[PDB]
Design a protein around this ligand. Structure first.
Ligand SMILES: C[As](C)(=O)[O-]
Ligand SMILES: [Fe+3]
Length: 203
């Protein structure tokens, strides 16, 4: 029940309430259910009412809102298209839990596969992080369609700057092995400080 690491937001958060479980839209990939259980790191008690946002790239490494191929990092990052696939928000229930129906994320040059998340509690940005995957799980996914028709080198977790800098080992989702055989099933327990103001947002 130790404090989960924070990880940089990166440049592609879009602060919009899109409150839905299934975030897939028209995207193609392998279905993945992601369950996040939040607890207060002081007490280990579930946190109720916290808004959890996630965003992630599609199989080819594309973020919605930023679909133009050359995305250049800037001070002022604004979306240039209205698409919002693979983005959503859910509110934690009585047990501190949200579930999202998503896809396994793509990689893009210079990054390992990951899902971004951001948590609002008490009118503050309490926690910003990233979800990483076990190397064995990543391997199995890359041998499947459509990920097997992306031909770029996949960066591994140990090569990834964000994983290394921000202690990504503590943020690896646990995939049920049973479910690598309708939909993959992942659980990640997080311990956060709901009275923290994160300074890891881009803007
Ligand atoms: C108004 As809020 C808890 O989404 O920062
Ligand atoms: Fe990213």
């Amino acid at each position: 029940c130790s404090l989960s690491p924070e990880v940089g937001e990166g440049p592609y958060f879009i602060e919009e309430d899109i409150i839905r479980s299934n975030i897939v839209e028209d995207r193609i990939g392998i279905r993945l259910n992601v369950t996040l259980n939040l607890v207060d790191f002081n007490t280990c008690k579930p946190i109720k009412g916290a808004k959890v946002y996630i965003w992630q790239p599609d199989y080819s490494g594309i973020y919605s809102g930023f679909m133009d191929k050359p995305r250049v990092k800037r001070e002022k990052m604004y979306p240039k298209d209205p698409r919002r696939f693979l983005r959503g928000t859910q509110v934690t229930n009585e047990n501190g839990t949200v579930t999202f129906e998503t896809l396994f994320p793509g990689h893009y040059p210079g990054r390992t596969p990951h899902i971004h998340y951001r948590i609002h509690a008490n009118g503050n940005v309490a926690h910003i992080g990233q979800i990483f995957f076990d190397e064995s799980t990543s391997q199995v996914i890359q041998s499947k369609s459509p990920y097997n028709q992306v031909h770029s080198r996949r960066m591994k977790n140990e090569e990834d700057g964000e994983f290394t800098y921000f202690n990504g080992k503590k943020s690896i989702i646990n995939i049920d092995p049973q479910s690598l055989s309708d939909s993959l099933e992942g659980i990640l327990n997080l311990a956060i400080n709901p009275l923290h103001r994160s300074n890891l947002m881009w803007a």
